[PDB]
């Protein structure tokens, strides 16, 4: 009975991880803007996207869009955060305008305390990414779950 719950928990984690795979493996080489009060390839800071702790935001290249149909792949902005101890995906469907747009916030994984991301430059894992011209060779997304603790997943970035 509790075992059904723990089996479901592992399924929940996989739904989250596969969603993260579809973003972090398909990182687009395009600079996005944070329209508050600048402009980067990978955005990474405290309270970004109104996260309770760390927040990440970057451009994503989508190919199998069910709604729209561009063969070459639509570029859209995506992001991750923690809110009320849930890992949440944030998605921007349309381009950036001074009007602003309705973001799509989707909770992926429950009972997640902390989000942490480390970047591999080529020889060493670092805590920030100031380079706005080129992506890091690899990205390690670490999720701190209340039950399982720290789980990390590494992603190789395509170069350009």
């Amino acid at each position, epitope marked *: 009975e509790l075992s059904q719950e723990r089996t479901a928990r592992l399924n929940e984690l996989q739904r989250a991880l596969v969603m993260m795979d579809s973003d972090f493996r398909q990182i687009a080489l395009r600079q996005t803007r*944070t*329209n*508050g*009060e600048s402009k980067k390839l990978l955005h990474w800071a405290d309270y*970004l*996207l*109104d996260s*309770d702790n760390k927040g990440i935001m970057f451009a994503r290249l989508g190919w199998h869009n069910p709604q729209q149909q561009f063969p070459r792949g639509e570029v859209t902005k995506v992001g991750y955060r923690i*809110k*009320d101890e849930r890992l949440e995906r*944030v998605w*921007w469907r349309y381009p950036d305008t*001074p*009007a*602003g*747009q*309705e*973001g*799509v*916030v989707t909770p992926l994984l429950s009972d997640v305390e902390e989000l942490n991301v480390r970047f591999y430059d080529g020889k060493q894992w670092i805590n920030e990414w100031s380079n706005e011209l080129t992506l890091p060779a690899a990205i390690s997304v670490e999720l701190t779950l209340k039950d399982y603790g720290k789980i990390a997943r590494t992603y190789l970035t395509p170069e350009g």
Partner: nanobody
Amino acid sequence: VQLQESGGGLVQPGGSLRLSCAASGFAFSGYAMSWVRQAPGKGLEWVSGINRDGSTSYTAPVKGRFTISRDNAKNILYLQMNSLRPEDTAVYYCAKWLGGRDWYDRGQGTQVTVS
């Protein structure tokens, strides 16, 4: 419903009005909140926003004229509108704020009118 607005209606140009937003069903105090409007003949446009710590932000065409505030005790977001111009006539929505000018979980809204 999580966000319900109140205090709309008609006012003479140059008049004042205070929109209210009843928050419920989530940890209001820990969220950044915003106001968004839709004027006739235009899409939805971000008006103002208030951070969890209290810091505020405004669009140029409303700065120093509209004032956003929040009451964490009663879970209510306010928008004090002063010197109301005809151009402000729009459907004002209350929403959660992502930073920048982007919003989500938009409320049903209230009609504010003037000409």
